Design a protein around this ligand. Structure first.
Ligand code: NAD
Ligand code: NAD
Ligand code: UD1
Ligand code: UD1
Ligand code: NA
Ligand code: NA
Ligand code: NA
Ligand code: NA
Lengths: 338, 338
């Protein structure tokens, strides 16, 4: 199929594009380069074993979206474009709402005009908010997320849902996931945070490489087996894979298809650290701090539905996530070249 | 003060503008005329006893907003502009999200750029959704509204709230209300629905004037005193007044100020009908139908907080709401002239 991949040069999108191309689809990448570099492109093509057309531009530009859609005769859209830094969302809520809420709205408005009706939304499990019972199941009502980031994601899920109700011929997947980690096995693609890394893994990696001194561990008194927070980490390759299957299998199948993408288990902060020490051949430095801001003791997603329905499940381990991360870090210490 | 009144030529805004001008503020009206006519303008000026500057344009046009803001040195913005037809929201969700969510976002983005930090949001009590205990109190968490209309309102409330958190010097009022009815006492301004009227009152009025045959009453078996739905109706003049006080009193007072605007009591469908029969001098025709779509038995707002805090409370009766409505209908059967 002809797939427009918004945010394709980013972390998860870049990995998703390689997999798309490997499956032989025709890939059109749309990215504004606000959080990714052109230098990834060629790696994409190479590992993908095929050429992905690249378009520099913004989802908020509805006109341009429509153009692209028509110009390329798109069948489906996988939408990764957006902003995803939680604390930054609290400081700059407007930007988050503009990029995510209006950004997606502009994007689907254009699809409508261009008559594109297949969509894969890269959601977030933050949507469950404090509406648990854990692990989270797609049948659980969402709760109220705490940052503007979380809220923007649920808002978009809601909009898409209503849209689908009004235009029942649309196929929309809401892919909810938690913590994407790792990197392509080649070691030539991986997560390239620009500043202080958001996620645990990269933060750890930077400590490990000497860029950081010690990992602050927030709260060593949670009601967990080791006292640290328990989260759900998913290898970015498994995630990429989820995206492709979801895209291939749901195209032209009307409805709102909600699926948690995860390993179906949680790992504590120490488990991740220890996995990483083992990966990089040396003890990661860390210390304990008091319980953080918007953090809970433990949560992870129930991924039974995608297994049953898409026949998808993760295949990589936490140890590989660590290794693959160390591998990329170690091969391209400076990340993507300018 | 210098107030930009978005959606000022509409129903509630037009009444609010008259009151503003009477208080002697400098009024700038911004409206796209999608649901109002220029013909209201002169009536505004007249009843207002002053000249309101009019700008034809859209809230979604951020550039234009910023321009206006600067050009007029605005102190505060009262925001009524948007779409508000519930069933239409289900059919055309995108338009509702664009106009309301993106429309407000564009508007406040512009304020930011123009350094305007006083805002009065014309909210809706639909935000409480099914998160009751009734009557609703500002201290009650909101629930999940059922139409895209309701959801768009809560989304906007959320955005503003986060914005205020990030930019603490902003003063933002979230004015929640239910059913605005009635018309200016002059009989020269009132609600002018274009097609099949949304609200009970006008629908009734049209039946009364002969434009409609019979009022369908949805559900005569609710757990209410008379078996029909109990709602909260508020004379548009009292609402206008609420808006002015809120605007005068909260300017430069940082925070998110939430206030229910209502009479603090409910009236059933039959109570409204009977009030109207009495107003128009003849029995309104109606029949019963089965319980409607997104309708509950009874709800109204608790308006204690605005009384205590703004020293505001309604002063008009249901009977006046009916009379004032009949008065306008009767003086301008064709509504606003083209
Ligand atoms: N990485 C995570 O921890 C996390 C977890 C949940 C959800 N997600 C979601 O996945 C998507 C991106 O995730 P990621 O980790 O690959 O981030 P990323 O920043 O690496 O990828 C996002 C890409 O989108 C681009 N982009 C941002 N705003 C844009 C706009 N308006 N127009 C065009 N391109 C724009 C950026 O330049 C970047 O290449 C978002 O939908 C995000 O909410 C990621
Ligand atoms: N009337 C009600 O029953 C109801 C109850 C709750 C909330 N409200 C709110 O009050 C506001 C309007 O209420 P109303 O009853 O006066 O409706 P109305 O349609 O009479 O007034 C809205 C005005 O906004 C204008 N408008 C719409 N989209 C615009 C845009 N993008 N740019 C500029 N102008 C635009 C219309 O032309 C119209 O004059 C909205 O915020 C609505 O959600 C009304
Ligand atoms: C804080 C954060 O980024 N929130 C993200 C994440 O939360 P999430 O908490 O799941 O992920 P994090 O990477 O932020 O932290 C994982 C765990 O490690 C801890 N930790 C993390 C970093 C660090 O430097 N030190 C430390 O102790 C936290 O207590 C937590 O218990 O879920 C979403 C997935 O849909 C992301 O899009 C959010 O952007
Ligand atoms: C249906 C509807 O417009 N929803 C509106 C309203 O709901 P709300 O139900 O409060 O107001 P309505 O005018 O729609 O109806 C009031 C009552 O009369 C009944 N009724 C109404 C019309 C009619 O033709 N026949 C009839 O029986 C309904 O059962 C209800 O019990 O609250 C919001 C106020 O914040 C508005 O912005 C919503 O747009
Ligand atoms: Na429909
Ligand atoms: Na770099
Ligand atoms: Na801040
Ligand atoms: Na008319």
């Amino acid at each position: 199929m002809r797939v427009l991949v918004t945010g394709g040069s980013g972390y998860i999108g870049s990995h998703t594009c390689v997999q798309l191309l490997q499956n032989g689809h025709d890939v059109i990448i749309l990215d504004n380069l606000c959080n990714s570099k052109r230098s990834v492109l060629p790696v994409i093509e190479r590992l993908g074993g095929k050429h992905p057309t690249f378009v520099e531009g913004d989802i908020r530009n509805e006109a341009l979206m429509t153009e692209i859609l028509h110009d390329h005769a798109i069948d489906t859209v996988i939408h990764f474009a957006g902003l995803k830094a939680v604390g930054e969302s609290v400081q700059k809520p407007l930007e988050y709402y503009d990029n995510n809420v209006n950004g997606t709205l502009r994007l689907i408005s254009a699809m409508r005009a261009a008559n594109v009706k297949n969509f894969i939304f890269s959601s977030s499990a933050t949507v469950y908010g404090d509406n648990p019972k854990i692990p989270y199941v797609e049948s659980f009502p969402t709760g109220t997320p705490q940052s503007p980031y979380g809220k923007s994601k649920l808002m978009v899920e809601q909009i898409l849902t209503d849209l689908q109700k009004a235009q029942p011929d649309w196929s929309i997947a809401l892919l909810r996931y938690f913590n994407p980690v790792g990197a392509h096995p080649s070691g030539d693609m991986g997560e390239d945070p620009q500043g202080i890394p958001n996620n645990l893994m990269p933060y750890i990696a930077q400590v490990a490489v000497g860029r950081r001194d010690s990992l602050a561990i927030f709260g060593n008194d949670y009601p967990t087996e080791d006292g640290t927070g328990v989260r759900d980490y998913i290898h970015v390759m498994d995630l990429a894979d989820g995206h492709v299957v979801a895209m291939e299998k749901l195209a032209n199948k009307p409805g709102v298809h909600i699926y948690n993408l995860g390993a179906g288990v949680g790992n504590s902060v120490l488990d991740v650290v220890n996995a990483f020490s083992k990966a990089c051949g040396k003890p990661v430095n860390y210390h304990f701090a008091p319980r953080r801001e918007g953090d809970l003791p433990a949560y992870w997603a129930d991924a039974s539905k995608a297994d049953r329905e898409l026949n998808w499940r993760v295949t990589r381990t936490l140890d590989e996530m660590a290794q693959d991360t160390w591998h990329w870090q170690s091969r391209h210490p400076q990340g993507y070249p300018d």
